[PDB]
Every structure is written in C-alpha cells, then in structure tokens.
Amino acid sequence: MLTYQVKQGDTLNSIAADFRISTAALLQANPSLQAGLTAGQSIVIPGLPDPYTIPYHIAVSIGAKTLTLSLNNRVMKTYPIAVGKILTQTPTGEFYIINRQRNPGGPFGAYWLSLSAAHYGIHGTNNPASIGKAVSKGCIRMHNKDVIELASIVPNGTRVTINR
Amino acid sequence: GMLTYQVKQGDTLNSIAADFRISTAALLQANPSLQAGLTAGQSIVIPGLPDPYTIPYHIAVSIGAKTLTLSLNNRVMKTYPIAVGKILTQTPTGEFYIINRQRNPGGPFGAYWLSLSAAHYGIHGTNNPASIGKAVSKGCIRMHNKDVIELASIVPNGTRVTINR
Ligand SMILES: [Cl-]
Ligand SMILES: [Cl-]
C-alpha cells in the first residue's frame, strides 16, 4: 500500500487534500494517528492500488515540454504538453496519479487526472495553441486526443516524475 | 517594510517561489544567505510586497459558514457569500496573503483573480453564479463578480487572509 512520510507543517487536512481523500478515510487507514500527527512517521494512503506493482511510469520534462508514458521501463507513447508559466510553474518532483474524471469540459477538456499535489493535475485543453508552451497556472495540459489515450491506459497509483 | 516567510522542512527555493509568485532570482536576491541552505524555522524576506501587519485590512474566510468577512482596523465592515472547495478538493486552511491580482481573466475566473500565498490558489470571480455559497470548487474561493471587484478595489496586495474550517 502507498505510504507517505509526514512532514513538519502537515495536517490531517493538508494531507487529505493532496491525496484527494476524506479525513475519515485517512484516519480509518491509520489507527496510529489517534496518538498525533508527527513528522518523520509513515502513514498509508487509502484508495489506491499498490504502486509497487504498477508497470506504468509517467515522466514529464518541463524543459522539453514532453510527457512520456512507459510500460516495463520502455516507452509506449510520447506527447507534447503545456506547463506552468514562469511565475506559476509546474512543480518538480515525484507524484502519483490519484484519480480521474471523464469530460470535465471547459478549459479542462476531455479528462482530468489528479496529481498527488493539491489542485494539480494532468488535463486536456480547449486551447490547442497552448500546447508546447509555458502558459498554465501549473497543471500539465495535453491535446484532448492525447489525454484520452493516457487516461484509458494508466491506473490510479501510477508514478509521475516531473523534471526540469 | 517587507513581508516575511518562515521556512518549513520540505520547502525549496522553487516551492517558495511558486507560493509567492516570484522568480527564484528575486527570492535569492532578497535573501543572499539562502545559498548556504534552507533551515526550518528561519525567516526570509519575500520581495515585492509590504509588511502585511502595516495593512489595516484583514480578511477572514469561514469554510463552514461559506463567508468571506472583511475587517478594517479590527472592525467588521462587509461580509460576502463564497464558494469553497469540494470535500475531496478543499480550500486550504491557515494564514495566507493576497499576493497579486489580474483584472478580468474571464472564463471560470470571471471579473478578477487575486492570488493567495499558496501555489495555484486564489480568490476569484465566476461565470457560474449558482455555485456561490456551495462547496464546489477545486480549492479556490469564488465570489460573485461584483463582489470580487468590490473586494479587490478595497484591499491591497499583502493583505492578510485567514482561512478557518
Ligand atoms: Cl485547475
Ligand atoms: Cl485555478
């Protein structure tokens, strides 16, 4: 099961928001939390497949404006993306796909895939000219046809590694 | 004066820069000591903004009440209905500041966007007035367009925004 290391400053609700779960679910999965939330301790995040057995991996290059989908550490597809503006960048680091919603429409296009950072995700677009540019509030945007392909394949729990 | 931020473990130059909508160059320039490392608990300067404690306005947001209250010199002057984040994508709680603003961004953001000191979060208008008063957003605070215009025309960047469950 997916684990998370508690950081100084974390709260039950800040963690819940990153992982798109209720505090009820968070507490149910972690009886230890009754004793208090303490930095350095590990907790389990409910609602996800075991990420260790997921053969898919997503790698994002902010600099190259590309997203690669790999299966068994070999590349299946490569897509161009939009990324965050220079003052509102897409964050670098290690994330997970948490959930997805079909056809959110509007600026989100054909799919929204939640990333394990509050408010961040991978989604479609109503604005094709934005793809390939640093123009977003921080999300990764793809052409609708591409995010549909991506969502149709990858399970929740899939790792998303974002690099410069 | 200058606004200050207290570093927490896990913070990076980039994460802080994203929260305060500044470049890492600006952050570093204002804090020459950071090159030697970030330590939890240290206070750093955030350029481009005044001392928030010099601004006489204070905004209080209640997620429960679905209200944003504006105070001046610790007197309540106006209260507005707001939309807040859905249960799985809640509005974050704590102490924030208004960081910058953009007039008439349009789309779901309506007549105004005010950035809050958490990356991707802000107070903004809406092209969906029915949503105001409900827990329906990805995490932002939404107001009626006329309300966010009014709020934005009163309060300056750096204004303290306290968000309570
Ligand atoms: Cl968004
Ligand atoms: Cl937004």
Swiss-Prot record, chain A:
Where is it predominantly found? other
- Which keywords are on file for this protein? Cell shape, Cell wall biogenesis/degradation, Glycosyltransferase, Hydrolase, Peptidoglycan synthesis, Sporulation, Transferase
Its pathway?
Cell wall biogenesis; peptidoglycan biosynthesis
Q: Where in the cell is it found?
A: Spore wall
Q: Which GO terms describe its biological process?
A: cell wall organization; peptidoglycan-protein cross-linking; regulation of cell shape; sporulation resulting in formation of a cellular spore
Stated EC number for the protein is 2.-.-.-
> Origin, by domain of life?
Bacteria
State the GO CC annotations.
Answer: spore wall
Alphabetized Pfam families for the sequence? LysM, YkuD
Q: Which InterPro entries match?
A: LD-transpeptidase, LD_TPept_cat_dom, LysM_dom, LysM_dom_sf, Transpep_catalytic_dom
The LysM domain extends over 2-45
Active-site positions on this chain? 123, 139
Disulfide bridges in this chain: none
Q: Which SUPFAM superfamilies match?
A: L,D-transpeptidase catalytic domain-like, LysM domain
Domain comment, in the record's words?
LysM domains are thought to be involved in peptidoglycan binding.
Quaternary assembly: Monomer.
Cited PANTHER family: L,D-TRANSPEPTIDASE, L,D-TRANSPEPTIDASE ERFK_SRFK-RELATED
Q: What else is known?
A: Regulated by SigK. Could also be negatively regulated by GerE. Transcribed by SigK RNA polymerase.
What function does the entry list?
A: Probable enzyme that may play an important role in cell wall biology.
Family statement drawn from the similarity comment of this UniProt entry: Belongs to the YkuD family.
Q: Tell me the protein's name.
A: Putative L,D-transpeptidase YkuD
Species? Bacillus subtilis (strain 168)
Q: What is this organism's lineage?
A: Bacteria, Bacillati, Bacillota, Bacilli, Bacillales
